[PDB]
Amino acid sequence: QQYKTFMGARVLWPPECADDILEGAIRETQDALKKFEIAREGQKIAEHLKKYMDDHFDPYWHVFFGKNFGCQAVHNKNRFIYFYIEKTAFLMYQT
Amino acid sequence: SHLDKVQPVIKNSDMSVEMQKEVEEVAKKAIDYCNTDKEIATFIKDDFRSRYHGTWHCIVGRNFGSFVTFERSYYIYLYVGQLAILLFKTG
Amino acid sequence: IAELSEHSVNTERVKTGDRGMSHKEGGWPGNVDPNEAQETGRFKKRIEKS
Amino acid sequence: KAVTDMDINELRKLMIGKAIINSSDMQGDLLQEAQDVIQSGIENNSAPVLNIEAACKYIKENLDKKFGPTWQCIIGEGYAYDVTVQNNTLLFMFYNGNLAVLIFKS
Amino acid sequence: HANEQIIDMPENSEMKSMKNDAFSQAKFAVENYKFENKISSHIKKFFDEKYGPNWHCVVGKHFNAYVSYDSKNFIFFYEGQLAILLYRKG
Amino acid sequence: LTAQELNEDMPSKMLEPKNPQAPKNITVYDYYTRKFKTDELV
């Protein structure tokens, strides 16, 4: 439950996801937001992130990002990444 | 010398002292700027919304009873003259 | 098949506190109490002291 | 007689159960449930002298259980307020005499 | 009031109960638990016993998500104000 | 299983034998159980 800030993004201090992959995913999400805002056409940015994960990581990645939501899921070892950027929290688990 | 005369007093405050001091100046400025009480409520909500992002509900009346569900440490209660400046941000 | 671990993450919910107050009483100094007759009576005498 | 005989003091004394609705923004079926609960609750908690805090506490608890977790209602003799609420979540009705009631869902 | 929902479940293939169970479970679970995190765990557990494992469900009042799911195993519906999404992957 | 005292009264911290990189918890579905099973110990 102890949130930590890394590379300008707030995420769980103990990282469920791999340190290498988690940093890449956070950088990609920040770049995507810089281009497309969450508030307008928010569905498009989430879809782009999911396709990007398949290109550089194992396939069938699940990506869910919302301002307020609660979820519990089963994921592969070191395949769960949860982080908060500004007021938006992005959670992705690889299946 | 009117600003010295109003002497706005906060009966109940649930906010940081530095933030609370800023509210007193805005409250005094809003009363002189707004011709009517209805205008004062709109001005206070607009200034706070610009200063702090979120949903702000403000009600000011000579006599009223209020029970509200506001984010903790975002509710400041101040009374000047017969007007109550009450702002409570709800998520 | 890779080993699967399930983790549940929920976005923090901003706290909601319910408080009820009455502004029916007229504006008064914080030190003085509007309901108490003694506090109001002493304050009025002090004003007329000019 | 009639309206000419009637006076503001006389009208308030003559009827205390009269219900007047000034602003409606909530669905009518929802309003009927809310109107019956608020009128019954205020009279029960009115006591010897009406308490603004007492009426709001009873209304706030009943509304939270009845519809949603975060429900805010404010009642005052006179007030000016700007409130941002969800569609069909705000009902405004003032009781006979100097009693203004505002109930909204956030 | 759940004006628009996405339904992708088999009809008259004897798996018709999965759609019915999701609507019934969401209404009962959401009212009693009254927690976003708890609703996802309860809905996932009931579905897991009845139709096997590898089921992921996320419940949020407001959220945007993109995911890959097995065909005819994904149903999206709104239970009152709350929105619940449940699907089976793997 | 020992605790190192930081100088000048800093918040106390200790080292542990367990490897941090290894997954915090491993869960395997059991058909006999018929529900997801989670084992905190790894």
Side-chain angles (χ1 to χ4, degrees):
Chain A
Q1 181 177 348
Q2 175 180 357
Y3 287 95
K4 188 58 178 299
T5 75
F6 97 53
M7 205 161 190
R10 188 159 177 250
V11 82
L12 200 50
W13 178 212
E16 295 302 320
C17 183
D19 289 345
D20 170 11
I21 298 179
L22 175 166
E23 183 178 2
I26 289 188
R27 199 50 194 176
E28 196 49 4
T29 58
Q30 280 177 143
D31 286 354
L33 295 174
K34 200 71 175 60
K35 181 55 180 180
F36 328 104
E37 316 68 354
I38 293 183
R40 57 194 304 176
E41 305 173 352
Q43 152 50 3
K44 176 202 310 175
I45 196 187
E47 180 182 341
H48 155 105
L49 182 57
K50 182 290 189 306
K51 279 184 175 56
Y52 163 87
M53 290 306 171
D54 294 3
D55 294 355
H56 308 106
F57 294 113
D58 295 351
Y60 306 91
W61 259 106
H62 291 260
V63 166
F64 274 74
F65 59 88
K67 307 191 63 177
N68 161 25
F69 77 83
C71 183
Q72 177 188 7
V74 175
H75 55 78
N76 300 295
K77 306 189 310 177
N78 289 337
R79 289 307 176 263
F80 176 98
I81 313 179
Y82 181 54
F83 68 90
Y84 259 96
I85 61 171
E86 303 307 4
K87 175 46 185 180
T88 60
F90 290 53
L91 177 63
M92 30 197 178
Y93 51 91
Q94 182 275 5
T95 298
Chain B
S1 62
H2 185 71
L3 306 182
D4 313 337
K5 293 298 178 300
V6 295
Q7 270 303 16
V9 176
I10 52 144
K11 274 304 178 184
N12 180 342
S13 68
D14 315 270
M15 267 168 35
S16 42
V17 170
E18 181 292 332
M19 185 179 295
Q20 163 182 309
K21 173 190 302 178
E22 153 193 336
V23 181
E24 295 177 349
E25 287 194 359
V26 167
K28 295 188 300 60
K29 190 66 178 180
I31 298 180
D32 74 45
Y33 190 99
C34 307
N35 305 178
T36 61
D37 52 2
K38 168 63 68 61
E39 220 303 331
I40 308 179
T42 296
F43 174 103
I44 296 158
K45 176 195 304 298
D46 288 354
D47 186 15
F48 273 85
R49 184 175 295 175
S50 178
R51 289 167 175 270
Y52 308 99
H53 317 272
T55 302
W56 293 82
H57 312 85
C58 168
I59 301 178
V60 55
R62 165 188 62 272
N63 290 322
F64 63 76
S66 60
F67 213 118
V68 291
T69 302
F70 54 84
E71 293 185 11
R72 283 199 48 84
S73 305
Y74 281 114
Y75 176 77
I76 198 178
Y77 182 75
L78 73 75
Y79 63 89
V80 62
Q82 315 307 9
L83 299 67
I85 302 183
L86 157 56
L87 51 83
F88 47 103
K89 188 175 63 167
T90 307
Chain C
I1 307 178
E3 307 176 4
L4 295 174
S5 67
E6 76 169 0
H7 281 288
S8 64
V9 301
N10 177 13
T11 70
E12 280 60 20
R13 188 174 181 177
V14 185
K15 299 167 180 51
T16 61
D18 289 345
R19 187 180 295 93
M21 293 300 293
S22 174
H23 185 83
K24 168 179 51 57
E25 293 177 350
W28 259 99
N31 302 351
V32 201
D33 305 320
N35 284 166
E36 313 302 342
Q38 300 174 348
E39 275 60 353
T40 72
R42 295 165 324 168
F43 191 91
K44 291 183 185 182
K45 286 191 174 183
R46 295 181 188 105
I47 283 185
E48 44 190 356
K49 272 194 165 189
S50 202
Chain D
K1 213 183 178 180
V3 284
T4 63
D5 174 14
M6 288 316 178
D7 298 329
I8 61 171
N9 293 338
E10 301 290 13
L11 283 172
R12 296 156 181 164
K13 184 175 183 181
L14 167 62
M15 42 206 175
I16 63 179
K18 306 296 183 57
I20 186 181
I21 303 179
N22 171 12
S23 304
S24 179
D25 189 9
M26 201 171 73
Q27 300 174 346
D29 188 6
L30 306 180
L31 295 172
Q32 169 190 3
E33 307 170 347
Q35 286 169 47
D36 303 3
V37 167
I38 58 181
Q39 294 187 14
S40 178
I42 291 183
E43 297 171 343
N44 291 7
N45 69 44
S46 283
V49 173
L50 190 58
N51 305 323
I52 294 308
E53 170 282 339
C56 270
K57 169 179 293 296
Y58 170 113
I59 291 184
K60 162 61 165 178
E61 294 169 9
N62 284 223
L63 266 292
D64 279 6
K65 185 179 180 179
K66 216 78 166 188
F67 302 86
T70 181
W71 190 287
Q72 306 184 22
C73 73
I74 36 67
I75 79 175
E77 162 77 44
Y79 44 82
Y81 66 75
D82 289 345
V83 175
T84 66
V85 294
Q86 311 169 355
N87 289 337
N88 309 26
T89 72
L90 155 62
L91 150 61
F92 180 113
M93 165 187 175
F94 39 65
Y95 196 83
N96 64 34
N98 61 353
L99 294 94
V101 176
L102 167 70
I103 68 180
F104 59 81
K105 157 67 170 54
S106 62
Chain E
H1 284 277
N3 309 353
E4 175 63 17
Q5 327 90 340
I6 293 179
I7 300 182
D8 180 350
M9 302 297 298
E11 286 192 1
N12 290 350
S13 73
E14 293 177 350
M15 296 323 314
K16 183 178 179 180
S17 70
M18 279 188 180
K19 195 196 74 58
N20 299 1
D21 283 323
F23 279 105
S24 176
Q25 274 303 328
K27 176 290 177 183
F28 166 96
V30 157
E31 176 54 359
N32 305 359
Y33 285 58
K34 186 177 186 61
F35 210 47
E36 291 54 23
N37 173 8
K38 279 188 173 181
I39 289 335
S40 291
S41 69
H42 176 105
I43 295 180
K44 176 182 179 303
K45 286 175 186 59
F46 170 94
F47 263 96
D48 275 354
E49 301 184 6
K50 196 162 189 180
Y51 316 113
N54 292 359
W55 278 78
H56 320 122
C57 78
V58 169
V59 175
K61 305 178 178 302
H62 148 101
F63 68 96
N64 281 355
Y66 198 62
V67 80
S68 66
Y69 56 74
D70 300 6
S71 44
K72 306 173 299 182
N73 296 325
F74 177 80
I75 187 186
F76 173 85
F77 59 57
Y78 278 83
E79 197 292 335
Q81 289 59 17
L82 188 48
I84 297 180
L85 177 63
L86 72 77
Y87 51 93
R88 170 219 293 269
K89 164 53 186 178
Chain F
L1 195 275
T2 64
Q4 62 186 178
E5 53 185 357
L6 305 306
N7 203 340
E8 295 302 320
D9 299 6
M10 291 199 203
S12 66
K13 67 178 178 180
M14 63 176 300
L15 59 174
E16 294 181 3
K18 64 175 58 182
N19 157 232
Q21 189 185 25
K24 176 56 181 181
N25 68 342
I26 298 181
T27 71
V28 174
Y29 180 59
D30 274 342
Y31 295 68
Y32 176 77
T33 309
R34 188 57 177 178
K35 62 175 292 182
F36 258 110
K37 178 175 182 295
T38 178
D39 294 353
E40 167 55 343
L41 183 158
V42 306

